[PDB]
Design an enzyme around this catalytic site. Sequence first.
Site, PDB file in Angstrom:
ATOM      1  CB  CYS A 147     -14.673 -29.967 -47.111  1.00  0.00           C
ATOM      2  SG  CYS A 147     -16.142 -30.968 -46.784  1.00  0.00           S
ATOM      3  N   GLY A 154      -5.039 -26.346 -40.031  1.00  0.00           N
ATOM      4  CA  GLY A 154      -6.218 -25.768 -39.421  1.00  0.00           C
ATOM      5  C   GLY A 154      -6.202 -24.271 -39.605  1.00  0.00           C
ATOM      6  CD1 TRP A 181     -12.396 -33.208 -35.432  1.00  0.00           C
ATOM      7  CD2 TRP A 181     -10.841 -31.607 -35.503  1.00  0.00           C
ATOM      8  NE1 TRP A 181     -11.366 -33.584 -34.602  1.00  0.00           N
ATOM      9  CE2 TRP A 181     -10.394 -32.624 -34.635  1.00  0.00           C
ATOM     10  CE3 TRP A 181     -10.018 -30.509 -35.732  1.00  0.00           C
ATOM     11  CZ2 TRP A 181      -9.169 -32.569 -33.983  1.00  0.00           C
ATOM     12  CZ3 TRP A 181      -8.783 -30.453 -35.071  1.00  0.00           C
ATOM     13  CH2 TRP A 181      -8.380 -31.483 -34.213  1.00  0.00           C
ATOM     14  CB  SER A 183     -19.871 -28.717 -38.907  1.00  0.00           C
ATOM     15  OG  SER A 183     -19.044 -28.327 -37.813  1.00  0.00           O
ATOM     16  CD  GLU A 394     -17.001 -18.687 -39.266  1.00  0.00           C
ATOM     17  OE1 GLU A 394     -18.058 -18.672 -39.931  1.00  0.00           O
ATOM     18  OE2 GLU A 394     -16.077 -17.866 -39.459  1.00  0.00           O
ATOM     19  N   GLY A 395     -12.008 -19.568 -37.191  1.00  0.00           N
ATOM     20  CA  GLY A 395     -10.836 -18.746 -36.894  1.00  0.00           C
ATOM     21  C   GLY A 395     -10.562 -18.718 -35.398  1.00  0.00           C
ATOM     22  CG  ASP A 398      -5.504 -17.909 -29.724  1.00  0.00           C
ATOM     23  OD1 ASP A 398      -5.557 -17.375 -28.571  1.00  0.00           O
ATOM     24  OD2 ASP A 398      -6.092 -19.028 -30.036  1.00  0.00           O
ATOM     25  CD  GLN A 474       2.717 -14.819 -33.044  1.00  0.00           C
ATOM     26  OE1 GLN A 474       2.474 -15.463 -32.020  1.00  0.00           O
ATOM     27  NE2 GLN A 474       2.532 -15.329 -34.257  1.00  0.00           N
TER      28      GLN A 474
HETATM   29  C1  LIG Z   1     -16.505 -29.326 -33.444  1.00  0.00           C
HETATM   30  C2  LIG Z   1     -15.640 -28.751 -34.571  1.00  0.00           C
HETATM   31  C3  LIG Z   1     -16.245 -28.354 -35.751  1.00  0.00           C
HETATM   32  C4  LIG Z   1     -15.537 -27.808 -36.814  1.00  0.00           C
HETATM   33  N1  LIG Z   1     -16.161 -27.466 -37.971  1.00  0.00           N
HETATM   34  C5  LIG Z   1     -15.414 -27.345 -39.121  1.00  0.00           C
HETATM   35  C6  LIG Z   1     -16.009 -27.397 -40.391  1.00  0.00           C
HETATM   36  O1  LIG Z   1     -17.219 -27.590 -40.561  1.00  0.00           O
HETATM   37  N2  LIG Z   1     -15.183 -27.265 -41.479  1.00  0.00           N
HETATM   38  C7  LIG Z   1     -13.814 -27.109 -41.366  1.00  0.00           C
HETATM   39  O2  LIG Z   1     -13.113 -26.974 -42.383  1.00  0.00           O
HETATM   40  N3  LIG Z   1     -13.245 -27.049 -40.132  1.00  0.00           N
HETATM   41  C8  LIG Z   1     -14.032 -27.188 -39.012  1.00  0.00           C
HETATM   42  N4  LIG Z   1     -13.419 -27.164 -37.764  1.00  0.00           N
HETATM   43  C9  LIG Z   1     -11.961 -26.987 -37.613  1.00  0.00           C
HETATM   44  C10 LIG Z   1     -11.622 -25.720 -36.852  1.00  0.00           C
HETATM   45  O3  LIG Z   1     -11.896 -24.593 -37.673  1.00  0.00           O
HETATM   46  C11 LIG Z   1     -10.127 -25.787 -36.510  1.00  0.00           C
HETATM   47  O4  LIG Z   1     -10.010 -26.666 -35.381  1.00  0.00           O
HETATM   48  C12 LIG Z   1      -9.539 -24.447 -36.186  1.00  0.00           C
HETATM   49  O5  LIG Z   1      -9.378 -23.743 -37.417  1.00  0.00           O
HETATM   50  C13 LIG Z   1      -8.168 -24.597 -35.497  1.00  0.00           C
HETATM   51  O6  LIG Z   1      -7.248 -25.367 -36.275  1.00  0.00           O
HETATM   52  P1  LIG Z   1      -6.447 -26.469 -35.463  1.00  0.00           P
HETATM   53  O7  LIG Z   1      -7.385 -27.244 -34.512  1.00  0.00           O
HETATM   54  O8  LIG Z   1      -5.745 -27.276 -36.493  1.00  0.00           O
HETATM   55  O9  LIG Z   1      -5.404 -25.661 -34.569  1.00  0.00           O
HETATM   56  P2  LIG Z   1      -3.992 -25.068 -35.037  1.00  0.00           P
HETATM   57  O10 LIG Z   1      -4.147 -24.226 -36.239  1.00  0.00           O
HETATM   58  O11 LIG Z   1      -3.023 -26.248 -35.025  1.00  0.00           O
HETATM   59  O12 LIG Z   1      -3.650 -24.123 -33.851  1.00  0.00           O
HETATM   60  C14 LIG Z   1      -3.287 -24.592 -32.566  1.00  0.00           C
HETATM   61  C15 LIG Z   1      -3.045 -23.411 -31.646  1.00  0.00           C
HETATM   62  O13 LIG Z   1      -1.933 -22.628 -32.150  1.00  0.00           O
HETATM   63  C16 LIG Z   1      -2.378 -21.315 -32.403  1.00  0.00           C
HETATM   64  N5  LIG Z   1      -1.606 -20.854 -33.573  1.00  0.00           N
HETATM   65  C17 LIG Z   1      -1.583 -21.458 -34.793  1.00  0.00           C
HETATM   66  N6  LIG Z   1      -0.763 -20.772 -35.605  1.00  0.00           N
HETATM   67  C18 LIG Z   1      -0.263 -19.730 -34.894  1.00  0.00           C
HETATM   68  C19 LIG Z   1       0.613 -18.678 -35.195  1.00  0.00           C
HETATM   69  N7  LIG Z   1       1.154 -18.533 -36.432  1.00  0.00           N
HETATM   70  N8  LIG Z   1       0.913 -17.806 -34.244  1.00  0.00           N
HETATM   71  C20 LIG Z   1       0.366 -17.916 -33.018  1.00  0.00           C
HETATM   72  N9  LIG Z   1      -0.471 -18.890 -32.659  1.00  0.00           N
HETATM   73  C21 LIG Z   1      -0.792 -19.794 -33.596  1.00  0.00           C
HETATM   74  C22 LIG Z   1      -3.862 -21.400 -32.605  1.00  0.00           C
HETATM   75  O14 LIG Z   1      -4.444 -20.123 -32.287  1.00  0.00           O
HETATM   76  C23 LIG Z   1      -4.219 -22.450 -31.584  1.00  0.00           C
HETATM   77  O15 LIG Z   1      -4.257 -21.808 -30.281  1.00  0.00           O
HETATM   78  C24 LIG Z   1     -14.153 -27.700 -36.681  1.00  0.00           C
HETATM   79  C25 LIG Z   1     -13.534 -28.088 -35.492  1.00  0.00           C
HETATM   80  C26 LIG Z   1     -14.267 -28.627 -34.462  1.00  0.00           C
HETATM   81  C27 LIG Z   1     -13.559 -29.086 -33.183  1.00  0.00           C
END
Ligand SMILES: Cc1cc2nc3c(=O)[nH]c(=O)nc-3n(C[C@H](O)[C@H](O)[C@H](O)COP(=O)(O)OP(=O)(O)OC[C@H]3O[C@@H](n4cnc5c(N)ncnc54)[C@H](O)[C@@H]3O)c2cc1C
Lengths: 567, 567
Positions: A147, A154, A181, A183, A394-395, A398, A474
């Site tokens: 969590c 994210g 989100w 799992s 899992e990261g 990008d 970047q």
């Molecule tokens: C089906 C599913 C299961 C998941 N499982 C889990 C779980 O069990 N536990 C949990 O904790 N999370 C979970 N996640 C969350 C998932 O790890 C996040 O969605 C992911 O880390 C991306 O975060 P975000 O969606 O907030 O995107 P953001 O971090 O908002 O990023 C949006 C975009 O901007 C880019 N970006 C962000 N910052 C920068 C930067 N500084 N420079 C350049 N580009 C940047 C990113 O690469 C991405 O392309 C899950 C998500 C889904 C959809």
Amino acid sequence: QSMSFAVGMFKGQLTTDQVFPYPSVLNEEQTQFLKELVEPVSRFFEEVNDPAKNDALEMVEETTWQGLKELGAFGLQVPSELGGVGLCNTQYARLVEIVGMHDLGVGITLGAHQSIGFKGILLFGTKAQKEKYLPKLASGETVAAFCLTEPSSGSDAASIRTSAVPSPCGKYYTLNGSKLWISNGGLADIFTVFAKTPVTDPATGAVKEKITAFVVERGFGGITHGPPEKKMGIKASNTAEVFFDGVRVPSENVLGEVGSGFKVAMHILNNGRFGMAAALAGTMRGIIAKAVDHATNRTQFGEKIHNFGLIQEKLARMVMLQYVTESMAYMVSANMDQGATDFQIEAAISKIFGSEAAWKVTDECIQIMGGMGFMKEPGVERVLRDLRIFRIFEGTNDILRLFVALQGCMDKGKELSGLGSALKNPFGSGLSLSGLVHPELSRSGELAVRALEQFATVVEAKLIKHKKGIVNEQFLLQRLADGAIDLYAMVVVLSRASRSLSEGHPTAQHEKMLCDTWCIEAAARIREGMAALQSDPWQQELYRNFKSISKALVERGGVVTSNPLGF
Amino acid sequence: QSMSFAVGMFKGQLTTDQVFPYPSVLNEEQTQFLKELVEPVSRFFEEVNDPAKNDALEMVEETTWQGLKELGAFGLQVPSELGGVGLCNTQYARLVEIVGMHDLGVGITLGAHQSIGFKGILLFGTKAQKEKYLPKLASGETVAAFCLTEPSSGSDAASIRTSAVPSPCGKYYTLNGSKLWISNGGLADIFTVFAKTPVTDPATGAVKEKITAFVVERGFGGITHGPPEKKMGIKASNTAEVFFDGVRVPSENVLGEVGSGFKVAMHILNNGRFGMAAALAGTMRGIIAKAVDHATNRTQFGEKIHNFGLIQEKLARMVMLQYVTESMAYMVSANMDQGATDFQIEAAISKIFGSEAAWKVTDECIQIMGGMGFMKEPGVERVLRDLRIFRIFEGTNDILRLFVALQGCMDKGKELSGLGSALKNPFGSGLSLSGLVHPELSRSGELAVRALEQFATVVEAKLIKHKKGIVNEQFLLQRLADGAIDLYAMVVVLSRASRSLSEGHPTAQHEKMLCDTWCIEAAARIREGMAALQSDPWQQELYRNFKSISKALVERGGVVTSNPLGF
Ligand SMILES: Cc1cc2nc3c(=O)[nH]c(=O)nc-3n(C[C@H](O)[C@H](O)[C@H](O)COP(=O)(O)OP(=O)(O)OC[C@H]3O[C@@H](n4cnc5c(N)ncnc54)[C@H](O)[C@@H]3O)c2cc1C
Ligand SMILES: Cc1cc2nc3c(=O)[nH]c(=O)nc-3n(C[C@H](O)[C@H](O)[C@H](O)COP(=O)(O)OP(=O)(O)OC[C@H]3O[C@@H](n4cnc5c(N)ncnc54)[C@H](O)[C@@H]3O)c2cc1C
């Protein structure tokens, strides 16, 4: 000195201890035990699990779920004394590849449980915590969830807002927040939860907010979850919001040290990371069988289509991607098993590479199948839908590219900075893989060494130019990460194919060909990519224009131009 | 001499009549009429159609279906005297982009109907056939379907087995066969059907089996269809097997000439082809708005994410792909409207480019959105699912690449062959786009001309080397097609941006930047790609290995190697 090949390559060094010879880590008893597990796990996925049904139902069928508990699948890496199967990372990789081959939805539910959901207890748990929690985690009586993610946070884990406030008595923390989100969020009874807590500085007493990790039981009270989210793929995996409202968490449920929770999160995600490549190597193995079957049996234009060059090249490229991915997965798992402490760059590379490889391989399988590939019945479109998320969770790939490039640059930057440090007292390459790569692969070995030199030359020049400001470059960082990915891919296949040749394995000549073919093109990508960074006078024009074009889009809210008619 | 730029470029010629200046074809009245249609069509898709609902229901909602009939959407290109809206190709492109922006499932049902389903009546119909059939086609009272594909025959249309045998009296043909994956197959009352018929040679009377095209009414009897196929995307579009069992087709329902049905099929598919790029340019416009909105409003790491280079480059690349696609679509439609007879290579390029562009743009939109992009609610995953088929139907992109390369080579090959033809009687570059490209784009114009010379040099060398055997050199043909695609993309944007600059359009400086940025990288791809074909001594090694690797996969039935453990 670091034993990491990836750390070394950014410095123009060949640090080969964790790469050559391709590692073998299992003893005879581990090997036999693993064989006796592969059989029943494979039969279970062949005969009991139905991936199309789980996708259609948007949950794992009950008989399958209960069967997996009975099979031991919820505690593969938990020691036998604590109720688990007791596997090491390399044994785990072998079983994860079966799950990845058959059902990525089941894979994510089991991985969310044990690769990350309670992994922190395995890595940082006290004896008391391990003994209390692991037995029921391993049997699947209590499902786990990791969590971290929140609506606002994210990629930037440091920005989370969920809070945990200590009681005056010091006996518990009160946890408040919501997670997004997650799992298994709707299934879990045990949560690893990351929250901001006040942390007292041992020296001055100054209080600062930092992340702490906690083991939280649903039964502590105040925990609810939202309904399952609807999503493109891995539909059988439960994904839910989790809400923590005034949850009393005992102080003894802190995982690791108070204030060290960011580190705990990152270590869990790093430790689990090889499992993705392992799973996806399995996915690709199954998809390639499907494509090859189609190409073997489909007549068009008077021949079976495997006789046409376009199809040959597609199939060849698919298997090279599978072989690289699989070789990376088992190298990282072996390094972990052998006690490596520095594998984070390699693990990130494996995740990036494997997720993008599996996507491309499955996309090309659809293309080989033609119209059939778009239909539901063959099941390939389901696998494509499942794969899309692996480039994001899992990261994000990008952020992981930025991590790879900046982490690799770090030690080189430190060396360069040390050069102009000392006060003035006015008053008085030779690099070679000879002897490591098999002689039959000597040319490809030389390609790798030349590519490493090209890469390291650009890394040094850009660190001298940009210094600590490189963190904001970047466009450059993405391109350096791509070089790093290709360089590690080269050496992993060189190492694997070299061992196969030395040992006279039956597939050694085929592996040699896979390696040579991979290396010719990877070397060319590194050469052209490094030249673009170092010596191309139009590269800075491209960068300026990317920024200007994007700024104009943002000002408009979308495409700036009309169509040619103007309305 | 051909007026086609693409034909010319394979010969190292600049044939610019169909490219510069960027064409304008509508008169003032057509422009105003089109404006008065854009408004109601846009409102209909904004307010009445629900793309998520159609996807969920796996059919177009009845109110939407009836509304589209009322809107005139089933007969956009049918002359007004025959019950249609009377639009030319450029006007049609403008409306198709609205449909593509909003609902590709609706788009395919309407396109299957009129872009290909009855298009042959428009192109080859007699006066009697047009008057009998077009009014009810245009109102949507009778839906149409294009019936070519069979279980055995997809890409290889010449291999179809459906048969049509003439009666002794000559009054009718008896049609027997089955067709596969027919869009609107379960909805249509009019089918354009391709069948093998005996054809008598006018000179000798010899009978040979050739394809003939027929207009077939469901009401002729003997026609049934299968249930709707379940598929990854465009789920609202009906796709069904169609069965013809002893169908009596009147001899006057032959479309075109008996035995000329292969030509009829190819002309229909060619004529319709620009419509795909038009639609997909619209898809991309909508997707870019979604990505830009996300990037504008999402904070991560302390800033809105549009401030990060990785995101800037993604967005810039998306809009360049949209602009190229849209520019191609309207160029080809204008060429058609202006009476071009040679546009098949350009149309194929537009289909390949636009389908792959839309796929990449939507995939990157998901990536920008993060986890949200994988969820159902935002609707982007639905658009990705819809897009996958566009690389496969209306000609697979692989077959279309072979077509582009071989069709381009044809006239050059003919010239080269004419060189050593005459019997011996023993007994007695300067190329420039100056004056066509706007001066502000002169550098990019020069990049295009240098790239054209590089391309044409390789085409000539490979035709001399391989002669008619070049047809089997598929690895090479794919790479030549890619050069051709990039070359046409360069000149289309050079032409469009040049006109914008000359006319002082408000977006001209932004367009100049799009063009320059596109051209720098396209020129580099052509340079590196042509060098790989001509001067790279490892290229033949790659080709040999693709074939050897694929052969080994086929012998095994899948991946040859085990995992590193060997079991
Ligand atoms: C089906 C599913 C299961 C998941 N499982 C889990 C779980 O069990 N536990 C949990 O904790 N999370 C979970 N996640 C969350 C998932 O790890 C996040 O969605 C992911 O880390 C991306 O975060 P975000 O969606 O907030 O995107 P953001 O971090 O908002 O990023 C949006 C975009 O901007 C880019 N970006 C962000 N910052 C920068 C930067 N500084 N420079 C350049 N580009 C940047 C990113 O690469 C991405 O392309 C899950 C998500 C889904 C959809
Ligand atoms: C949803 C849907 C709607 C459709 N709509 C219609 C419709 O309305 N009417 C209709 O008639 N058809 C329709 N089609 C059929 C579609 O046009 C065909 O699927 C397409 O032409 C591909 O044929 P195929 O699937 O038989 O693949 P194949 O032709 O069997 O090709 C399989 C693979 O081999 C490749 N290949 C084939 N030959 C060669 C070669 N010589 N060299 C190299 N590579 C080769 C192809 O590129 C492809 O990658 C539809 C299909 C679908 C799925």
